[PDB]
Amino acid sequence: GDVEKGKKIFVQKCAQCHTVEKGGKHKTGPNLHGLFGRQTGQAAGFSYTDANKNKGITWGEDTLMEYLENPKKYIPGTKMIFAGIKKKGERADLIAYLKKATNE
Ligand code: HEC
């Protein structure tokens, strides 16, 4: 994926609810640092729905590709109010950005 294109997507569609940096604040949504290779619902200090807390999957490229297409379909009951990114290539670019920015 294209990290620069992914950053733009993140800024436009995600940043208002999410920070990525280590120690970043929670906003409407949880800070995302450390997301890759961890189960759903594990950001310290964030109050998740039971739906996100108990989804029982590990985040990675494949599960983020599915989730970001349509969050409510993957996690019914989620309080992330976002319809999804419909284009597969845009999801891949965003995910490549996230794999860098949430791991720095
Ligand atoms: C505010 C309106 C949001 C927007 C825009 C985005 N997200 Fe979000 N996200 C939000 C909330 C409130 C939550 C918790 C939902 C719950 O039911 O408890 C989330 C959750 C996620 C997660 C899961 C995190 C985890 O399990 O630890 C991910 C991976 C995620 N959000 C990513 C993400 C992306 C990449 C966004 C832009 C496309 C995006 N979110 C937008 C709130 C909001």
Numbering used by the authors: 1 to 104
Give sentences from the paper.
In the mitochondrial intermembrane space (IMS), it acts as a single electron carrier from complex III to complex IV, also known as cytochrome c oxidase (COX), as part of the electron transport chain (ETC). Using purified protein and cellular double knockout models, we show that K39 acetylation and acetylmimetic K39Q replacement increases cytochrome c oxidase (COX) activity and ROS scavenging while inhibiting apoptosis via decreased binding to Apaf-1, caspase cleavage and activity, and cardiolipin peroxidase activity.
While the glutamate mutant may behave similarly to the glutamine mutant in this publication, this is not generally true for other acetylation sites, and the glutamine should therefore be considered the acetyl-mimetic. It is worth noticing that Cytc purified from ischemic muscle exists as a mixture of acetylated and unacetylated protein, while acetylmimetic K39Q Cytc mimics 100% acetylation. Interestingly, the caspase-3 activities of recombinant K39Q and K39E proteins demonstrated a significant decrease of 90% and 87%, respectively, compared to recombinant WT protein, indicating that K39 acetylation protects the cells from cell death. In line with this, the cell line expressing acetylmimetic K39Q Cytc showed reduced levels of Cytc pulled down after Apaf-1 immunoprecipitation compared to the cell line expressing the WT. This also translated into reduced cleavage of caspase-9 and caspase-3 in the cell line expressing the acetylmimetic K39Q compared to the WT after treatment with 8 h of staurosporine, a potent inducer of intrinsic apoptosis.
